[PDB]
Write a protein that binds this ligand. Structure first.
Ligand SMILES: Nc1ncnc2c1ncn2[C@@H]1O[C@H](COP(=O)(O)OP(=O)(O)OP(O)(O)=S)[C@@H](O)[C@H]1O
Ligand SMILES: Nc1ncnc2c1ncn2[C@@H]1O[C@H](COP(=O)(O)OP(=O)(O)OP(O)(O)=S)[C@@H](O)[C@H]1O
Ligand SMILES: [Mg+2]
Ligand SMILES: [Mg+2]
Lengths: 419, 419
């Protein structure tokens, strides 16, 4: 009996539990309050129950535990975590905590934590003796993270283009630069699909900032890995809170020699949120951004590394350009040289409805020698040499035609070399 | 026992000492906190405790002492320095201080020092009577700093091309102008390796600004001399204080008739940090960059000189062009006339995968007569007059082809003269 199976289910669970456990009148309140009523009525019986979620530390040890199913909304379903347990188990923000849960006594309205039985999907005894993320020596991307799905579909074409445009490996740090209406959302969809198909072992999690609710629903009903999204309805303070929770959870996961992958849409929106939430430092840059305001997002982008001890943390965040706002241009300029992978999308190609609309010459990755082999390295080199002269629209038309003629990337290289 | 000895040890050993010395949960916190805890527990035992590092003076004499291996980061393990011994010893910023340290008392969190045993690797009385860096009369470069490794390595052609392109001497002010994806980082790496090998006597310092952590790790693991870097995650004040500490330490070392070399990557990033940290003065140049904001970086570049009394301070700083940000080239034409050694890297040569990509015709050195003998100067003049007409890509291809079949620079000279 866990809190998860009573959260993800729809209002059919509401009506069934109302007609079964005999609650007075449900279906007039948020899912958090419905779940609160169900848990209160079930704890009234006294049957043993347990919970799970992601730990969070407030400014004074007021331990909270959020749920990733509900996108980390602060509601009644949040689980109390006492400071005594915090200093006993030595837990910090982002820890995945599951264990026995306690009904509340008089004076409080939150379930506390009876005892833990799983910390970060591991024994709590072994979780304490773990090296910090900040104390891990970074390296370059070693293991190639292939995106070719290999099922011979038609959407996979764009994924194939990725394997020809910019190589992506474990621990990379990439920026997808694109104007509005250029295919960012479907590119992220295809990247998530490729990660779920080719690399089921690595943890995939997608963060969405101030996106429309319809796009959130489309994202959450297609990707395999869990997805967290905050709409533009919520204030930017919640955007910052969600981003901090995501990055802390990723750090905690990668501290256990796990491969974490984060997809962010968008870094510009997160920078906006940080700019409009952080108090002014008295120094305002061009475009209306505070000098310290951009310090926080960079750290979020700075966590991408390839730990030598074990595991890696890859971050692929998209950036908005040509949006008519000078502040977006300032943010992109400040983030221009940070990433080690660049994927440039052009509205000129997308105008002709040729997808994916990737500026092949501008897009690329740095020191990909450590990622891929050498023979296909010069294959891609000669491909780049022959595709360099003609224009980007013609380049993409030629690329998609030649890729559709063949079946796989290796077959594509075979045909290109033999012809 | 040495605080620096503990700092140089890796992260993991915190367990090996801690479980043997009284710490029950020492894994989960920042490394400097472990160092603080262990050295507190050692001061509890009562044996004498050493300390050393670079001194720093605050706005009110509230002095601190940082460590090089920590990249001059303000941490709990920093050594407190009261104004009393500052006044008695006449210490100044950038001093190298070594000696006793004292456990903190009630109301103090930092470790004070009992008495100094060595100042600037010299007796405090002898180091007391030293001349200011400002009062030292500058000169031109006299002692040639040859970069030819001479072991016939697989990369020694880069150093050979460097010697044939721009002669480097002691106390020389150099600029490396290159676009992105040109080869700045490991060109500087080869420079540092050649300095460490050919000239072990001179102190080698490498300074990196807002660089990616992987590059920082590679630089730390590759160069023999000490290297300091601040990643782009850190704010601009961190960059400014790191650069100030480095330049002050270099001045203090060269005040003792020592040769110091500073490799800077990059002066553009340091100028950007100074621009975004210095308060506005009401005069904004093109590209949204203040006027006096460039005052501080030039002083950092203005310390390269050759001294009558002794010692030398060479600075090789790289600059970025063809980036797309207006302030970058604004800084570039705000730095052309300052440097007396120029090294241009071109994108076109790098696009042909021919390395090192050095624009030989545009690069050069002024007042090279005082650095080199007349015979090899005439040989280089003959090479320059036979290399001028053909283009940079062809020039570098020809230079690499001719240098590959020879062994040393002199052999190349006779090979071209006999033809
Ligand atoms: N691989 C693709 N195959 C077919 N159509 C595509 C593909 N990628 C993008 N499109 C089309 O491109 C258009 C825009 O797609 P989106 O990814 O939703 O745009 P966007 O990048 O999210 O930019 P916004 O959200 O409108 S600011 C739609 O008409 C899609 O059908
Ligand atoms: N002498 C050389 N031999 C072989 N490859 C080289 C040589 N010099 C440069 N390269 C290659 O050219 C690229 C230069 O890499 P970097 O030195 O890291 O570039 P950079 O000058 O640091 O500019 P950034 O930091 O990437 S914007 C890499 O792909 C290297 O493999
Ligand atoms: Mg979209
Ligand atoms: Mg570099």
């Amino acid at each position: 009996m866990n809190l998860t199976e009573l959260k993800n289910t729809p209002v059919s669970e509401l009506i069934t539990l109302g007609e079964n456990m005999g609650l007075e009148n449900l279906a007039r309140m948020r899912k958090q309050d419905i779940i609160f009523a169900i848990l209160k009525q079930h704890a009234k019986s006294g049957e043993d129950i347990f919970g799970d979620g992601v730990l969070e530390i407030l400014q004074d040890g007021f331990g909270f535990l959020r749920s990733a199913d509900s996108s980390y909304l602060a509601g009644p379903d949040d689980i109390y975590v006492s400071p005594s347990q915090i200093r006993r188990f030595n837990l910090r923000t982002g820890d995945t905590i599951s264990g026995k849960i306690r009904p509340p006594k008089e004076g409080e309205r939150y379930f506390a934590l009876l005892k833990v039985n799983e910390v970060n999907f591991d024994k709590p005894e072994n979780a304490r003796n773990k090296i910090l993320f900040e104390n891990l020596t970074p390296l370059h991307a070693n293991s190639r993270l292939r995106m070719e799905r290999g099922n011979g579909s038609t959407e996979d074409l764009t994924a194939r283009v990725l394997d020809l445009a910019s190589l992506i490996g474990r621990g990379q740090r990439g920026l997808i630069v694109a104007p509005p209406k250029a295919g960012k959302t479907m590119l992220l969809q295809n990247i998530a699909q490729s990660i779920a198909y080719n690399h089921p072992d690595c943890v995939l999690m997608v963060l969405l900032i101030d996106e429309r609710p319809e796009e959130v629903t489309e994202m959450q009903r297609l990707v395999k890995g869990e997805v967290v999204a905050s709409t533009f309805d919520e204030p930017a303070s919640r955007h910052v809170q969600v981003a901090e929770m995501v990055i802390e959870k990723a750090k905690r996961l990668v501290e256990h020699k796990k491969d974490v992958i984060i997809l962010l849409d968008s870094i510009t929106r997160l920078a906006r949120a940080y700019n409009t939430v952080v108090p002014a430092s008295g120094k305002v840059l061009t475009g209306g951004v505070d000098a310290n305001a951009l310090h926080r997002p960079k750290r979020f982008f700075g966590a991408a590394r390839n730990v030598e001890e074990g595991g890696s943390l890859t971050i692929i965040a998209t950036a908005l350009i040509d949006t008519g706002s000078k502040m977006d241009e300032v943010i992109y300029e400040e983030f221009k040289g940070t990433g080690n992978m660049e994927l440039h999308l052009s509205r000129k190609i997308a105008e002709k409805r040729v997808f994916p609309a990737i500026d092949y010459n501008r897009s690329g990755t740095r020191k990909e020698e450590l990622l891929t082999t050498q023979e296909e390295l010069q294959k891609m080199w000669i491909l780049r040499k022959i595709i360099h002269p003609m224009g980007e629209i013609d380049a993409m038309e030629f690329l998609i035609n030649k890729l559709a003629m063949t079946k796989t990337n290796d077959d594509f290289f075979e045909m290109m070399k033999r012809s």
